């Protein structure tokens, strides 16, 4: 046994880290951890964003109908109104509304030539549970979302982050609020290619009627490049020709793979959502 | 009609509910006292559940051993299947190839084996053409080969299958086996069985006739995998067993008047009896030729 | 190289090699079964059909007493073997001995073998039988047989 | 040593920056304590640069706690979840004043090799080369020594 | 000649855990028919075997109770009699062994 | 999954008659061969 | 050692007996009614009154809905695992038989009603001063509904079933130390009639095994 | 010393849910000191890893090594035990699920060598351990077939990017 107290302590932090990696603790909200203020942290979260949220508004954004069910009945199991806790449904509905055509609006403009079939699935896929869930998650919505399971289901966090949306319509105004939209969520297209959004079948179809609106003559497809014909690692261009001019060309391992590819390169075009098309403009309004 | 595909789906769905039916029958978890009668393992008492436990729990409860070598059961001197759920307490002893005299072992090893056939025949044509399953002929052992009596479409009247066909039918009777599909058994009353099989004109005279014969017309149904057919006696517990298997030769028997009946004939051999290549070539041989029931 | 040496290197050498086969077989023949180990008892397994052929000389021939005073340590076995053994045998004209595979022997794990003299009065060894002439595979032969037998007499 | 560390790709939270720039810190939990030397340089943070930190920035919620504690820390949080704990032992009050400036300016990502000093998810606008981009095209696609109409 | 340098436990393994170090897996197992216990298809029975052995040592110290005595072999033929037999008509001539017990079912008068 | 072996399941009774077949087979396949100028030779 | 040390002034200190001073044989069809009499009867009062010796303020009347309390509350520690207060509730006899077998399973079990009013049927004290300890046994009668569903190791359901209340009788004896100042009356055994009927059966299936042979042995019928 | 496999039969589960899978019986049995060698018992367990309870018992009883005789005893009680206090049904419905060896407790005695020189012998002892899991053995693994190597190679081939560039 040796002398002293400082190596003994030290050895014990470095015995309890490794007992929480052992059995990692099971993760609860942060608001039941130390150093929680809910009215400070709901003031934090309107400026940290710059927005003149009203507070009343915005508190009531977060109480879902879950958490007001539930804190009822343990009222009524420990035999405790004052509990006439107004819920987020009306707020959510009109936050819900205002993206779907607010983020309609921001896109038609930009892109006249899609079709409504595809603005819709951009906008479902910008207003969808797993986008909405991370920008909620990322921007402290889920700490501030009074529900009554934790982890939040992900069906009430976007109800949430819709209400919060309703909060600033109500507060701010349709202005204000597309700004917030332009900047939290058509921010999630960055990178993103036009049909990994828009999951689509059977594109050469979906050419063809195109080109029949345009009055265009049917894609012909033809082997512009090949290589590795009859090895295990063929490469093949195909290009669609219209009155014999190219209007596509897509890469495969297979013709029909190729040719599918040149179908959706042609689809890119004709709709606007090239690769290289015009950045979108976060410029601040003139 | 129904399509081939929903007459399938129909069978099961009856043959299923039947099932469910005598299942609800029982109150809870009634117990019945199994004494095991054989030479081995002497005295061993299994209390099982009625309408629930099979002979092959029994075997569980043993080893593995009597669960990979018993083909069939002997409960009160009758011969049971080994998945048949045993009603009442009984004594029981397990049956298998090698025994002294395993004649009822080798007719239940007989039986599926003309099962596994006519389920092959019936799937290998095409939809155009019509397969009417008639019965399995009751052939003794020694006869050579085993029989299916088929009734095929009348377009199909100046057609014999080629040895390119037959092996066809060899590879589907393999996949069968591949498969390791159970011998499922369900005995219901003739009313069930005639409603299931109403459809095909011979089985329903052949259920009526197997009804006759026993005084409260309950008939024997086995299924594997989605074919339902109906049986002379306790099958083994499952597909695996065959090992060499191949569809010989299709005989059109005579009378040919009436209707062209063909004689779709087989022989095999389970794991624990396989034979050396030499010896296999030559009883496909004489299972090629026509046997005669008597 | 040992092509076509058919002894085996017993004991202490050759003399020894013997003396302990002698051992073995004197052993046999009063007790009419015995257990040892594998190679020894196919090794003395020869000796003991040889000695019944020695016996059915008779005990009048002269050569027959000297082998047999030999083989047989215990004198009140070579009447046995001239009066009881070698007639016993008297219409048969070889295979006196029976020779089968026990499990391992416990403390060294040895290969083991049981001899005895066909037609002893012990409770029969536990013998291998072939299968059952009932069993599916036999029947099918049955029939190829039946049918061969019938097609040559036609 | 890199290979014996993790890494990661350059990258941001919610594409900072793009539409609009949201500070990433979003607590801040000091652990003073009332009396011990180790904390003297963290007392009077707390009673003149506390307070003009927090006015500059009104998103960040501070935590101060005092408590009998031997090692003063600051624990930040950051809105993708990070959580950072730095000691302030012994620190001055200017040290301690860079330290929170500049939890306040770090993203929360971890702090480890970043593969590349840079990031694009739109490296092309003239099309990515492949090996056929400088090939010639040839009459009818015919390959090297293929006779046609045969 | 002695080792240049200690071998390394990843070179031990590979030498130890060789397939050819492993224990094979015996397929020549199977039930003995007559007492359900496990044999070699080659060697016969422990069980039967053990039972025939109790049954031949009890025999023959029978046999060394009516030999009373060293070099005593009889020049005639012995049969083993059990509790409730008589000697049969083949018998007749030969010493008699006389065992307090039934017949074993496995031990046929012949 | 036992290996097996040619006369291992045969009975008594069969193992002979086994024997005889095969042989003679044998035999009789051998002496078919004996005519190869009168079974179609190649070219000589 | 069964027993201590030899020549030890110190002894131990039993508080409980092991079995039922006189047992109370219950009528044969009282599941239907769900002289001697008064021979009985009388042997209870000349009991009772030693009972109400040693603690004057005693009362039959009130054991009944006592007695219930007690086998209700000994019977929910085992749902918990309240060893602490079960050894308030039961004795020293009962303690191993209630627990021993359900060391590693979970045990549910509840209480749903009270068919019939319990009735002390006997009641009876041990020879007086057997160790300077005198008892007191009072053989009460229930019929309730009873809910049990016992579980494994692994949390599968073994015994019972959790939701289906079914009909219990069972005559619980209790057993006191009057002797001991602070002595209390705690269940100390059950009376199972040999009528009673048989109890619901398990639900996995079991193999008693046959005789295990040797060699020399022959299996006789 | 340590003994923590004699405390996992002590582990109880919480009831399980109506819609819950059922879940299979875990039984854990050791013997401690084994006179014998803990690399020659590594072979003996390694050999039955993965078996059937049936399988395993019928390997062990023709192997000549001392330590089969002693592992087949283990299994022998471990298997009575399960049914007997682990709540399972069919008792040939058990498999090896982990069986390994360890060092025991070791004595050290003298070898007398030539020339007055002497070593050090260790009497070696051991232990086994093993864990036997309700149902039938898993399937062995299927050997990598030429399809998924071709699918596996073709998959690195389309997972590689243009490195050290934009
Ligand atoms: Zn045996």
Redesign the interface.
Known sequence: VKKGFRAAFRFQKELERQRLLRCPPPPVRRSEKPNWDYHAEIQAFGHRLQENFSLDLLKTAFVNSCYIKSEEAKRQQLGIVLLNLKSNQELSEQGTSFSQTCLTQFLEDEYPDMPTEGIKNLVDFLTGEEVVCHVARNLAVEQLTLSEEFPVPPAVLQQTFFAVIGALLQSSGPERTALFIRDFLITQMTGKELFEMWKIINPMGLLVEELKKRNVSAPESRLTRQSGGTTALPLYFVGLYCDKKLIAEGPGETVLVAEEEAARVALRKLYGFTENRRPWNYSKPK | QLSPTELTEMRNDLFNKEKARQLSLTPRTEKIEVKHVGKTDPGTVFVMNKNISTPYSCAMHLSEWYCRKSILALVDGQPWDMYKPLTKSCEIKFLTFKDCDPGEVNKAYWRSCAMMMGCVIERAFKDEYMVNLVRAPEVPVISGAFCYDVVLDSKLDEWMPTKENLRSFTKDAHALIYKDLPFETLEVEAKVALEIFQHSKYKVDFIEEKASQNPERIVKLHRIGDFIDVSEGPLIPRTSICFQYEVSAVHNLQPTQPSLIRRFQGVSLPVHLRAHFTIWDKLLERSRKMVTED | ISHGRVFRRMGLGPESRIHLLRNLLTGLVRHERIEAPWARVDEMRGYAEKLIDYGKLGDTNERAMRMADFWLTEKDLIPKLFQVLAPRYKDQTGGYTRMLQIPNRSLDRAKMAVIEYKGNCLPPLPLPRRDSHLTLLNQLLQGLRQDLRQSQEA | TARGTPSRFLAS???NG???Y??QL??L?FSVSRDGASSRGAREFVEREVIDFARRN????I?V?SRPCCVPRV?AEY???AVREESIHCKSVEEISTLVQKLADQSGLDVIRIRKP?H???????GQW???TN?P?TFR?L?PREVQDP | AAPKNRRTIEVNRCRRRNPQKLIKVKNNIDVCPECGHLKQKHVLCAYCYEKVCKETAEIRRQIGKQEGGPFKAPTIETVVLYTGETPSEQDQGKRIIERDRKRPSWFTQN | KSGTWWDEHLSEENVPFIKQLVSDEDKAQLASKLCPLKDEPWPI | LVIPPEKSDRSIHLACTAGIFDAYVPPEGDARISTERMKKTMASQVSIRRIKDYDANFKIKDFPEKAKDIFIEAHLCLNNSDHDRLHTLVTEHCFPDMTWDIKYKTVRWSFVESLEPSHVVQVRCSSMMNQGNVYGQITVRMHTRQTLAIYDRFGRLMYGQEDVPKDVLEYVVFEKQLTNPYGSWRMHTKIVPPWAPPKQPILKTVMIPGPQLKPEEEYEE | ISRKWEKKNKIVYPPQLPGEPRRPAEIYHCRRQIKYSKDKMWYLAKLIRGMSIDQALAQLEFNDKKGAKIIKEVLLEAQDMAVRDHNVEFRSNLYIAESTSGRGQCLKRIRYHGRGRFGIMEKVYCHYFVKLVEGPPPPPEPPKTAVAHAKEYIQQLRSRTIVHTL
């Open positions: 939270v919610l594409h793009l539409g609009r949201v500070q979003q607590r939990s009104p998103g960040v919620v935590y706690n624990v809105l993708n979840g840079f694009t998810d739109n490296p092309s606008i003239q492949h090996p056929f090939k095209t696609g390959r």
